[PDB]
Design an enzyme around this catalytic site. Structure first.
Site, PDB file in Angstrom:
ATOM      1  N   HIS A 198       0.846  -1.189   0.000  1.00 27.51           N
ATOM      2  CA  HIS A 198       0.000   0.000   0.000  1.00 27.51           C
ATOM      3  C   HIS A 198       0.889   1.250   0.000  1.00 27.51           C
ATOM      4  O   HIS A 198       2.061   1.205   0.383  1.00 27.51           O
ATOM      5  CB  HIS A 198      -0.904  -0.037   1.234  1.00 27.51           C
ATOM      6  N   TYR A 199       0.338   2.386  -0.433  1.00 28.41           N
ATOM      7  CA  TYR A 199       1.202   3.564  -0.512  1.00 28.41           C
ATOM      8  C   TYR A 199       1.648   4.057   0.863  1.00 28.41           C
ATOM      9  O   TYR A 199       2.650   4.777   0.953  1.00 28.41           O
ATOM     10  CB  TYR A 199       0.517   4.695  -1.305  1.00 28.41           C
ATOM     11  N   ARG A 200       0.954   3.663   1.930  1.00 30.19           N
ATOM     12  CA  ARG A 200       1.260   4.189   3.254  1.00 30.19           C
ATOM     13  C   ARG A 200       2.547   3.584   3.822  1.00 30.19           C
ATOM     14  O   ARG A 200       3.020   2.524   3.403  1.00 30.19           O
ATOM     15  CB  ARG A 200       0.104   3.930   4.221  1.00 30.19           C
TER      16      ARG A 200
END
Lengths: 189, 189
Positions: free
Chosen positions: B139-141
Site C-alpha cells: 500500500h502507498y502508506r
C-alpha cells in the site's frame, strides 16, 4: 537498513532542534516523469509552536508537463486554482530552491532537522530527483505524521474521530495541527 | 502531497490488515549507483503478533558493486559476514523478488499493507529502483517506526531509555520489538 560514513544571519529562536515542515504538490507520483508544481515550508520548534512560515511557491511548468496529470490530479489541481497559478508563475525549480533555502537558513542549520509532514516519504523522493540541493538540507530522519495516523486508525480508531486542500500551505498547516492533536490525544503529553 | 487516480493458497490467518515488515541492506545510500545486498521480510497481524517470517536473502553482487561501499559500509557489512554471503550467493534481485512475493501472497493481498520498519523511507527508494514488482505489493502508506523513536526522543526521552546488527533479519525483528515497546510505553495501549 541504510548506512554510510555520514549515517551511522537569523532568528533569536535559531536552534538545531527546530523542525522543518514541507509539503509538495506534483503532477503525479513518479519522480522520473512527473514534476513539482507547488511547495510550502514552515518551521516549528521541537514543541510544535510555529516560528516562521516559508515561501509558498507555485513552480512554472509547460503544458507538456501538465498534460501528464491523470484525471484525479487534473481535476484536483485545476479546481484548487493551482494549475492557473502554475501557468502564470515565472518561478523555476532552481529559483524555488534558492528561495526556500534562503528562508530556512535563518531558523535551523543544514542537516539538523528531520523532514516533517504528511506523506513525507513521497515528497522526499521528488526532492531527491528535482531539488537535491534542498533535500540535502534535511537530516536523514523523517517525522511522518501519516505513520501516527495509521497506527491510531488501527489501535485507537475512536480517538482519530475527534480530529477533523491539496494546496501546499493548507496541507502543511494541517499536518502540524494533526501532530499537535496526536501529542495530546495519543501520546498524552 | 501525492495524489493520483489510484491514491485519493494461503494461511487461515490471511487478512487485509496484516502488516508486511521489511528491511534491506545496501552498498550505499544512492539507488542510482548502489545496490541491494540483503533483504528480509516478516508478516505480523495488526496487533504486531508475528505470523510468519519470510526468506532472508543475500543478493549476489560483483566486486565492482561491492567496491562502491564507503568505509563504514565496507567495515560493517564485512564484519557481519554479509559480504561473504553476498559473494557466495547465487540469487539475483529478480529471484529475490520472486521468492519474497511468493512468500507474502500467503498472508496479505497485493496493495493492502503499508510498508513497515525502521528507516523505511530509504528502503522504499531502493525498492522503487531495483525491485519495482515488490514495491508495487505495498500500500502507498508507511509505518515508519523511526518516526515514533524521534518524537519520543524529543518529548519523552526518559521513556526511550527503557528500551535497549545491520543484518536484515535482526533489524526487522528489532523494529517490531521496538514498535511493540512504543505501543505499551508511549501510546499506552
Amino acid at each position: 537498513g541504510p548506512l554510510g560514513s555520514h549515517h551511522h544571519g537569523g532568528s533569536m529562536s535559531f536552534s538545531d532542534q527546530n523542525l522543518i515542515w514541507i509539503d509538495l504538490e506534483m503532477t503525479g507520483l513518479d519522480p522520473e516523469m512527473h514534476k513539482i508544481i507547488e511547495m510550502a515550508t514552515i518551521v516549528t520548534d521541537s514543541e510544535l509552536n510555529i516560528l516562521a512560515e516559508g515561501p509558498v511557491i507555485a513552480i512554472h511548468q509547460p503544458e507538456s508537463e501538465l498534460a501528464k496529470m491523470d484525471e484525479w490530479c487534473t481535476t484536483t489541481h485545476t479546481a484548487s486554482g493551482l494549475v492557473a497559478r502554475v501557468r502564470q508563475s515565472q518561478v523555476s525549480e532552481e529559483e524555488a530552491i534558492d528561495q526556500t533555502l534562503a528562508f530556512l537558513k535563518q531558523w535551523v542549520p543544514e542537516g539538523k532537522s528531520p523532514i516533517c509532514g504528511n506523506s513525507i516519504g513521497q515528497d522526499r523522493r521528488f526532492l531527491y530527483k528535482h531539488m537535491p540541493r534542498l533535500e540535502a538540507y534535511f537530516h536523514y530522519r523523517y517525522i511522518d505524521v501519516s505513520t501516527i495516523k495509521e497506527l491510531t486508525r488501527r489501535w485507537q480508531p475512536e480517538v482519530l474521530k475527534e480530529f477533523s486542500s491539496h494546496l501546499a500551505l493548507d496541507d502543511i498547516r494541517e499536518s502540524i495541527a494533526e501532530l499537535q492533536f496526536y501529542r495530546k490525544a495519543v501520546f498524552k503529553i
